[PDB]
Design an enzyme around this catalytic site. Structure first.
Site, short mmCIF file in Angstrom:
data_model
loop_
_atom_site.label_atom_id
_atom_site.label_comp_id
_atom_site.label_asym_id
_atom_site.label_seq_id
_atom_site.Cartn_x
_atom_site.Cartn_y
_atom_site.Cartn_z
CG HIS A 83 -0.79 0.23 2.44
ND1 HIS A 83 -0.48 -0.78 3.32
CD2 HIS A 83 -0.75 1.39 3.14
CE1 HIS A 83 -0.27 -0.25 4.52
NE2 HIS A 83 -0.38 1.07 4.42
CG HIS A 85 -0.06 4.53 4.71
ND1 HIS A 85 -1.07 3.86 5.35
CD2 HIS A 85 -0.60 5.69 4.25
CE1 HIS A 85 -2.18 4.58 5.29
NE2 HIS A 85 -1.92 5.69 4.63
CG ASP A 87 3.86 0.98 7.14
OD1 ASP A 87 3.19 1.70 6.38
OD2 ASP A 87 3.31 0.12 7.86
CG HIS A 148 -4.01 -0.33 6.80
ND1 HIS A 148 -3.76 0.08 8.09
CD2 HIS A 148 -3.12 0.34 6.02
CE1 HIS A 148 -2.77 0.95 8.10
NE2 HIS A 148 -2.36 1.12 6.85
CG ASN A 179 -3.60 7.39 12.01
OD1 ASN A 179 -4.69 7.78 11.59
ND2 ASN A 179 -2.48 8.09 11.85
O1 LIG Z 1 -1.14 2.05 10.44
P1 LIG Z 1 -0.23 0.85 10.62
O2 LIG Z 1 -1.02 -0.29 11.31
O3 LIG Z 1 0.34 0.42 9.26
C1 LIG Z 1 1.13 1.40 11.77
C2 LIG Z 1 1.65 2.84 11.62
C3 LIG Z 1 2.48 3.15 10.57
C4 LIG Z 1 3.00 4.42 10.38
C5 LIG Z 1 2.69 5.42 11.29
C6 LIG Z 1 1.87 5.12 12.37
C7 LIG Z 1 1.37 3.84 12.55
N1 LIG Z 1 0.50 3.62 13.69
C8 LIG Z 1 0.66 2.75 14.70
C9 LIG Z 1 -0.49 2.95 15.55
C10 LIG Z 1 -0.83 2.22 16.84
C11 LIG Z 1 -1.07 0.85 16.81
C12 LIG Z 1 -1.39 0.18 17.98
C13 LIG Z 1 -1.44 0.90 19.17
C14 LIG Z 1 -1.20 2.27 19.20
C15 LIG Z 1 -0.89 2.93 18.03
N2 LIG Z 1 -1.22 3.91 14.99
N3 LIG Z 1 -0.61 4.30 13.89
ZN LIG Z 2 -0.81 2.07 6.14
ZN LIG Z 3 1.58 -0.59 8.62
#
Ligand SMILES: O=P(O)(O)Cc1ccccc1-n1cc(-c2ccccc2)nn1
Ligand SMILES: [Zn+2]
Ligand SMILES: [Zn+2]
Length: 231
Positions: A83, A85, A87, A148, A179
């Protein structure tokens, strides 16, 4: 056992061999002020490697290539980003300068552009409609519908029964949605069900972040998403 967020300083990358010619790669990155792990996939294709997803940033993606050369010693010739983003496409410029052909769906490339994220060069045709599947060397790429993100893809390794769910599948220890600025909450469980119905033989399921499990990660993710929808 599987590398954990507390064991990997930011900037370092570990590899975990799941099967013959199939590995996950694990990195860590700081978001807000927490530290979080991230998985990608490595699949051997003859005498070359297929990379799935960057290691969340240019510095981690350069170490990912170093770890691959040190641990596997075969050239990474193609990479897929699941995707748009950071990461999944952060590091795509690193991959490209090292001569990797980078790929993503037109949806992913369009959204990365809008978002100001690195843009994979090649476009993966045949993945725009929910339920679409295409072959890509030793894997199959599957678009389950929006979850997601609207563009998320999953990756199945037939030879090894490995399903890489990417960030559409949560690890068991994740009990909240976090998020979801770009998620489709309303369609997310429906997209997960398409994964279940298309890959019911999957034996090893890799989430976008954290520990692998089995197909029970799909129901766990559905449970978490539905519980976030309800408040
Ligand atoms: O969204 P993706 O799943 O892929 C991860 C991600 C990737 C990049 C930047 C931020 C984030 N984020 C992490 C979280 C989070 C997850 C669990 C508990 C608390 C917070 N929220 N966003
Ligand atoms: Zn993402
Ligand atoms: Zn992610």
């Amino acid at each position: 056992e599987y590398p954990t967020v507390s064991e990997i300083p930011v900037g370092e990358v570990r590899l975990y061999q799941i099967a013959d010619g199939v590995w996950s790669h694990i990195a860590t990155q700081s978001f807000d002020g927490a530290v979080y792990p991230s998985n990608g996939l490595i699949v051997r294709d003859g005498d070359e490697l297929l990379l799935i997803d960057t290691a969340w940033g240019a510095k981690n993606t350069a170490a990912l290539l170093a770890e691959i050369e040190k641990q596997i010693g075969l050239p990474v010739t193609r990479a897929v980003s699941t995707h748009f983003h950071d990461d999944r496409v952060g590091g795509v410029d690193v991959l490209r300068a090292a001569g990797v052909a980078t790929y993503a769906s037109p949806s992913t490339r369009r959204l990365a552009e809008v978002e100001g994220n690195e843009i994979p060069t090649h476009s993966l045709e045949g993945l725009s409609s929910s339920g679409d599947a295409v072959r890509f060397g030793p894997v199959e790429l599957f678009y389950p519908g929006a979850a997601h993100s609207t563009d998320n893809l999953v990756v199945y390794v037939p030879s090894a029964s490995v399903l890489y769910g990417g960030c559409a599948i949560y690890e068991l220890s994740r009990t909240s949605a976090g998020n979801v600025a770009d998620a489709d909450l309303a369609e997310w469980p429906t997209s997960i069900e398409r994964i279940q119905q298309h890959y019911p033989e999957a034996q090893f399921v890799i989430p976008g972040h954290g520990l692998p499990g089995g197909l029970d990660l799909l129901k766990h993710t559905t449970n978490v998403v539905k519980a976030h929808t309800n408040r």
